[PDB]
Amino acid sequence: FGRDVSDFTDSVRDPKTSEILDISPCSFGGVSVITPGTNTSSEVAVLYQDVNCNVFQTQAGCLIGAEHVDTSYECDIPIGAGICASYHTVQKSIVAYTMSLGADSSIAYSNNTIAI
């Protein structure tokens, strides 16, 4: 048999046909559930942390059950890595988007003028 830094069998020699086999856990990864609220709707969006995979890939993982939106609102449901989800009228559905940092503005720089 074999053992790890934590006591657990990872390598076992096959009785018949000696050949060394690796044993790994079946379950691996992470999953989160995004819901607009039971009172509003019963639909949910599931986000799997460690997968490549209406699917839509984020930096946190592959998020399913929601639709991609190319315009940026403020954040109400803070999904990781800058993505946010909300209930919008697209009937309604869960939509994912990148959070808006702020309002764009530019000020002209001049060496002779001031504002009072």
Partner: protein, 423 residues
């Protein structure tokens, strides 16, 4: 003092740590499908731990939001990077550069050696190349995961760039709702006005001040590139956050009063009734370990929150205005500050004013002109060597004594040390 120098110091403050979550059903009672029946009988001990850990996850994002997201307008890069001889390059981003961070922020990001939790460790990576024995693959197999932060490194860099651009262009005015345009010349003159000295020094020695500013920036860059232990407070956070998870992983091989520390061995040699005692012992021990880990994480989160609050206060005061608090922003007299991003922290660059060269002067408390005392308006009289003159306490600027720079009160009998002269 007769001469001054411009010094730029650095201050490193952590703002957030690693955001983590645990799956107890996999850490304890791993894939047994028979022990899980006994885990339900022990009670809902897991919901409390997960709820306690979620609060820290929310707080570590609230801290970053409070520290950086202070300006509502996102100002653009002034695309000039040279205002009155003050070279603002190497602090603001360069459009013809791959990364969206400036040179100093890239150097800061290069110093910290993160454990590099890729946030996407797929089953294929942890199932192959097992000979490497990666620690992260060992933690994710036991239900210990690290969540990614809400604000990416690009958005924090954009926030710092907008803050620096607003400081360079707007000045101190953008601390309020609106921002008033002003050149960097009279902005520095106003900063020199609230420090104690007059506006004459800057408009007369702008070249020397700009040269000293550029040299200080270059020296800061060289110190960042050369020094080995600079972001130690930021590296310590990662070093403890990884060490706690590694300790929790290696704590799975302890016999908590049972025959063996590894299940599927007690269940294979003993029947249902006899193995339940050992399973309960192991569950109790591992639950105690999890509770200890959660308690230590909360205790660390308290200090991290305090540091984040201090960093936010220092940003709001030094970055968005001139502070008159002694030894708060920088060592010396505060002039301005520039914020820079850092891994799990923020770095402040404080521009200060330091007198350099001294000169001896004999002085008197007051002067008697015709029988009445002439006390100073603001400053101290000095004996330059030929006659009496009045000058400020921060720079030797001789001035002829007249009725404007002094106020008359009382007679020449109560005050001690009245030396006669003319006004």
């Amino acid at each position: 003092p007769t001469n001054f120098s411009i010094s730029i110091t650095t201050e490193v403050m952590p703002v957030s740590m690693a955001k983590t979550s645990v799956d107890c059903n996999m850490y304890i009672c791993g894939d047994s499908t028979e022990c899980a029946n006994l885990l339900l009988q022990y009670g809902s001990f897991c919901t409390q731990l997960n709820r306690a850990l979620s609060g820290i996850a929310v707080e570590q994002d609230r801290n970053t939001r409070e520290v950086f997201a202070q300006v509502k307008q996102m100002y653009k890069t002034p695309t000039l990077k040279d205002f009155g001889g003050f070279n603002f390059s190497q602090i603001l981003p360069d459009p013809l550069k791959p990364t969206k961070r400036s040179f100093i922020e890239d150097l800061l990001f290069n110093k910290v050696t993160l454990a590099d939790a890729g946030f996407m460790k797929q089953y294929g990576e942890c199932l192959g190349d097992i000979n490497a024995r990666d620690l992260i693959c060992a933690q994710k197999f036991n239900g210990l995961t690290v969540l990614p932060p809400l604000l990416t490194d690009d958005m924090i860099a954009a926030y710092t760039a907008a803050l620096v651009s607003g400081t360079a262009t707007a000045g101190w005015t953008f601390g309020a709702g609106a921002a008033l345009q002003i050149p960097f010349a009279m902005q520095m003159a106003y900063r020199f006005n609230g420090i104690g000295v007059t506006q004459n020094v800057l408009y007369e020695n702008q070249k020397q001040i700009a040269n000293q500013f550029n040299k200080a920036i270059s020296q800061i860059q060289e110190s960042l590139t050369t020094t080995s232990t600079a972001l130690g407070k930021l590296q310590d956070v990662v070093n403890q956050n990884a060490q706690a998870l590694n300790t929790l992983v290696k704590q799975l091989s302890s016999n908590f009063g049972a025959i063996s520390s590894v299940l599927n061995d007690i269940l294979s040699r003993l029947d249902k009734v006899e193995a339940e005692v050992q399973i309960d012992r192991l569950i109790t021990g591992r639950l105690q370990s999890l509770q200890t880990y959660v308690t230590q994480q909360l205790i660390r989160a308290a200090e991290i929150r305090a540091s984040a609050n201090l960093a936010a206060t220092k940003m709001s005061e030094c970055v968005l205005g001139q502070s008159k608090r002694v030894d708060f922003c920088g060592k010396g007299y505060h002039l301005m500050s520039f914020p820079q991003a850092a891994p799990h922290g923020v770095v402040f660059l404080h521009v200060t004013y330091v007198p350099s060269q001294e000169r001896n002067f004999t002085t008197a408390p007051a002067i008697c002109h015709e029988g009445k005392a002439y006390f100073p308006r603001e400053g101290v009289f000095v004996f330059n060597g030929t006659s009496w003159f009045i000058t400020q306490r921060n720079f030797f600027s001789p001035q002829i004594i007249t009725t404007d720079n002094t106020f008359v009160s009382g007679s020449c009998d109560v005050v001690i040390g009245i030396i006669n002269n003319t006004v």
